[PDB]
A paper describes a structure:
However, HLA-I molecules can present extended peptides (>10 amino acids), whereby the N- and C-termini are similarly constrained within the HLA-I molecule, forcing the central region of the peptide to bulge from the Ag-binding cleft. NY-ESO-1 is an immunogenic cancer-testis antigen that is spontaneously expressed on a range of melanomas and other cancers including myelomas. To identify the principles underpinning extended peptide recognition, here we investigated TCR binding of an immunodominant NY-ESO-1 13-amino-acid peptide (APRGPHGGAASGL) derived from positions 60–72 of the cancer-testis antigen, NY-ESO-1.
The pronounced movement of the KFJ5 TCR CDR3α loop is indeed prerequisite for HLA recognition, due to major steric clashes with P5-Pro and P6-His of the NY-ESO-160–72 peptide. In contrast, the KFJ5 TCR bound with a markedly reduced affinity of >200 µM, suggesting greater structural challenges to TCR binding.
Residue numbers in the entry:
A (entry chain B): 7 to 246
B (entry chain A): 11 to 200
Write the structure that this text describes.
Amino acid sequence: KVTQSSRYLVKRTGEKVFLECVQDMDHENMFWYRQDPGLGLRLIYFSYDVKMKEKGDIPEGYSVSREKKERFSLILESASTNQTSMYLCASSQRQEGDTQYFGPGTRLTVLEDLKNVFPPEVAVFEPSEAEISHTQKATLVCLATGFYPDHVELSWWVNGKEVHSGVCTDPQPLKEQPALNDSRYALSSRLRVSATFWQNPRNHFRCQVQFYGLSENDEWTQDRAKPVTQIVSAEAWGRA
Amino acid sequence: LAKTTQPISMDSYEGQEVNITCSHNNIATNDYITWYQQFPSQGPRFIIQGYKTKVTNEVASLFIPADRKSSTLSLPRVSLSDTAVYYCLVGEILDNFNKFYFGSGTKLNVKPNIQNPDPAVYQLRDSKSSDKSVCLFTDFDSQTNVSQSKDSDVYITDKCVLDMRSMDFKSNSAVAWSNKSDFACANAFN
């Protein structure tokens, strides 16, 4: 198991940022990469053992520490917007160095300002009667709209339990204002069930959207609610 | 390491064999050929390694010609879940490992073979109030192209495949909506 300290991060330009990679397999080798569109997976820094470090292909702007064998820290002394990325760490045993086990990934978004951070609004659209009649299936659609940055995870819950069968969520969000640099985002998902299952008023359908936003240490001065990390949902009961 | 060259992207259908060729003409004596597989929203994972002879495991086969200047990853009867980036890496291994150069690899897409295409466009109303609606284009064959919106106030998603696994049923769809009421689902994907 390879752990990363955070799944999502929102940080301001100029702030000092830490990402931790942790493994308890006593692996000698640890690695930090970032992953960007069109540029693939690029090596930042690695470490062959405790207190050892060596620059990777793109070390500029980064530093690392390896005080303990289990932990490889990635350090951004002064975050910049170009460091917005997906960060992936890995580890490997010295005698099996080419077999790298990767962590789950950390999305870091660096912003000049927190003014434009927004949580999603969420809405569930009920299945078409025409679909029900024609196919005996029923597709619910969820829209998560108006969020910024692109930090959401959408899930479907039926009668309080998460479902995966019959679901498809867009891999990529759409920009609501494609010409604007800090455009808010939208994301859609579908849940398809049998028509008779939708037709039961005892069945509860929820589209649940986890947003990774601000924390208690971030300041907020606007009248609108502070866009903290939060879960926003919309729901429908079945209908006859 | 030796430099590797592979296609940027590849398309396929569920159920077929997929073959990805990697070129590495400066490979040296002590180099091995390694492939990694990276699923969406995950880091890469090791899947196969070879030297000169054919290797087969649960995930793939690796074919290596006699001159070792290229190699081919063969993925069996691919599933939708095999949509992933595949990386070809050539270099020294084990205790002599130095570093990988992942590059961008090959983006493999896997399409479903829709058994009974039944294309239709539906309109769905908001559960909260039928003030808002969305359009759903669904059940079309996998060669159907869904175009992005040329209009800034209209939103059209890429196609998405859902799997109703208990019914052995898969379907394509795309969603479209607009911040205007006059928006007609009839022409939305047209």
